């Protein structure tokens, strides 16, 4: 069946990098476009980035150069590199999947990963 | 006496998407419009409020060039009084618009055989745009009767969809580059003039 699983969360020092992975199982990773979403405790959802089969990466204009979305298609996975961590990036992160041939419905979602940043 | 930089507008390597269309102010130069209309590259050259032949004889001020990329059958939506996704949520022209809409096919630059995905259009907004209003804001929006309090409700729709540009797509689905020139007719000491 369709499934998105994530990994890479934890408690890390600020300014250290992170690499969050979103492995997809059960569906072919092409012809769908992948999103990264985060939400802070006490805050609503905030969209991070999009990446397509081309390699076109679109980021949120609100946060710039903190993240880098990296798709890989040999093993149907999605990577996010997070650099120079600030204290406000304590968040639950989600991997999302849209069909390119319909409305922008995000269908199934990742269960999410917890990222806690402190000193 | 110096020339206006239309070559930096029409012959640019990259155009932004229609949700984030590029606006360039053209001023303090002599604009040679006769190389635009007599060029056979432009499929659509539709001017509202001005004839294209008389464009050399008039002095304008605050000329704006708006550049973006839309698919083939949406070029009719770059006009005053039109409805559609591009007119409502991406790029709205006013009813009192004076200027020129220029659009040409760019399939051999903006299509890749696997599919080009560098160009986006906004699919939904809460209200229609005001004329000449840019919405670069990408925000998660709801679906109805369940809030977007995480995954738990109806899953949350994304506003920006990318065009599926492949060169095997028929005409009408193919990339068309659109440049919209907007003028103001002689209200200040003018800076943009013909020869
Ligand atoms: C763009 O390049 C072509 C190549 O010959 C040229 O004919 C055309 O005049 C150029 N456009 C502008 C606005 O200079």
Residue numbers in the entry:
A (entry chain H): 1 to 119
B (entry chain C): 333 to 527
What does the paper say about this structure?
SARS-CoV-2 utilizes a trimeric spike glycoprotein for attachment to the host cell receptor angiotensin-converting enzyme 2 (ACE2) and for the subsequent cell entry step which involves the fusion of host cell and viral membranes. Given its crucial role in the viral replicative cycle, the spike protein represents an important therapeutic target and is a critical antigen in host immune responses. All emerging variants contain defining mutations within their spike proteins, with multiple mutations clustering within the receptor-binding domain (RBD) impacting both ACE2 binding and antibody neutralization escape, while mutations within the highly antigenic loops in the N-terminal domain (NTD) across these variants reduce antibody neutralization. Given the rapidly changing mutational and antigenic landscape of the SARS-CoV-2 spike protein, a structural understanding of spike protein mutational effects and the discovery of broadly neutralizing epitopes is of importance.
We next determined the cryo-EM structure of VH ab6 bound to the WT spike at 2.57 Å, showing that ab6 binds to the RBD in both the up and down positions, via a unique binding mode. Local refinement of the down RBD bound by VH ab6 enabled visualization of the ab6-RBD interface at 3.21 Å and revealed that the ab6-RBD interaction is dominated by contacts with the ab6 beta-sheet scaffold, which wraps around the RBD, extending this large interface to include its CDR2 and CDR3 loops but leaving the CDR1 loop free. This scaffold-mediated interaction necessitates a near perpendicular angle of approach for ab6 relative to the RBD, which likely can only be accommodated by a single VH within a bivalent fusion construct. Thus, the unusual angle of approach and dominance of scaffold-mediated contacts may account for the lower potency of the VH-Fc ab6 construct relative to VH ab6. The CDR1 and CDR3 loops of ab6 occupy positions that result in clashes with ACE2 upon superposition with an ACE2-bound RBD, with the CDR3 region directly competing with the amino terminal helix of ACE2 for RBD binding contacts, while the CDR1 loop poses a steric clash with the second helix of ACE2 without making RBD contacts. Analysis of the ab6 footprint reveals the inclusion of L452 and Q493, consistent with the reduced potencies against the Epsilon, Delta, and Kappa spikes, which harbor the L452R mutation, along with the BA.1 and BA. Thus, distinguishing features of ab6 include its ability to adopt a near perpendicular angle of approach relative to the RBD in both up and down conformations via scaffold-mediated interactions, while also utilizing its CDR regions to compete with ACE2 via steric effects (CDR1) and direct binding of ACE2 interacting residues on the RBD (CDR3).
